[PDB]
Amino acid sequence: AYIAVPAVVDSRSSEAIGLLESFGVDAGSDANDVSYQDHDYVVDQLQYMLDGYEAGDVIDALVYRNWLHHSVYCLLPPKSQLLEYWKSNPSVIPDNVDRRLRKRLMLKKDLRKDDEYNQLARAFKISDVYAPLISSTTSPMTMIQNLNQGEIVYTTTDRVIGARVLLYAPRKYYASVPHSRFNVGTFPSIATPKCSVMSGVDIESIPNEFIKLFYQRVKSIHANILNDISPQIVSDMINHVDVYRV
């Protein structure tokens, strides 16, 4: 199961604060099955990705995510530093790469000016070697689709949303989770039949203003197909103290 709440859910602190007695849920017991999810980085990625793309595209893409399906990005350095990494420590080379390109990268020549290797690198593109490659111009709907189907996704950029970003090469070549049957977290989805949203909190009172924008946009387009459940229904289904937060 999956439940979405109007708040930044986290697996570290949201258990300490609870958030369920916060919204008014009577989860208090030896429950230990309402496992939270990490959406801090997802909110940060949403903020960073609204900077270049358009809000409608980004939100309507992020709504179709299956948060109970683990996955992850991992970005590749550009083609030049990529080839430099192919060469040094060459025993990581995928087999898709051209036979000629591998036979020329396996050589210990200085490669100062190899008249044919320059052509072989010019006609080389990243998209053919690594199959799921998102884009520099992905038009993000395929991003969420590829996160839904598969375990690892290959990007050439940083503007991505949905999962964490992992490094492919060492840092030189760049510039400067179990389930629990009651998973919860922000950012509602309609991926499965068991995704629910907790109603009972007005839209104009949401304080984060990015969760707020997401909820307004998703609820004005998917009103008739979302599963609303009140705090009482959630309670029946389940069954450094910060000051200045009341």
Binding mask 50-79 for another protein (x = CB under 8 A): -------------------x----------
Q: How many residues sit in the footprint of another protein (CB under 8 A)?
A: 18
What is the smallest separation between the CB atom of 179 and another protein, expressed in angstroms?
10
Residue with Cβ nearer another protein (38 or 114): 114
Of the residues 29, 32, 91, 96, which one makes contact with another protein according to CB under 8 A: 96
Is 99 an interacting residue with respect to another protein (CB under 8 A)? yes
Q: Which residues from 14-53 bind another protein, rule CB under 8 A?
A: none
Is 116 an interacting residue with respect to another protein (CB under 8 A)? yes
What is the smallest separation between the CB atom of 99 and another protein, expressed in angstroms?
5
Mapping DSSP onto H, E and C, the string for the chain reads: CEEECCCCCCCCCHHHHCCHHHHCCCCCCCCCCCCCCCCHHHHHHHHHHCCCCCHHHHHHHHCCCCCCCCCEEEECCCHHHHHHHHHCCCCCCCCCCCHHHHHHHCCCCCCCCCHHHHHHHHCCCHHHHCCCECCCCCCCCHHHHHHHCCCEEEECCCCCCCCCEEECCCHHHCCCCCCCCCEECCCCCCCCCCEEEECCCCCCCCCCCCHHHHHHHHHCCCHHHCCEECHHHHHHHHCCCCCCCC
Q: Which residues from 140-159 bind another protein, rule CB under 8 A?
A: 149, 151-152
Contact residues for another protein (CB under 8 A)?
69, 95-100, 116, 119-120, 123, 128, 131, 149, 151-152, 181, 236
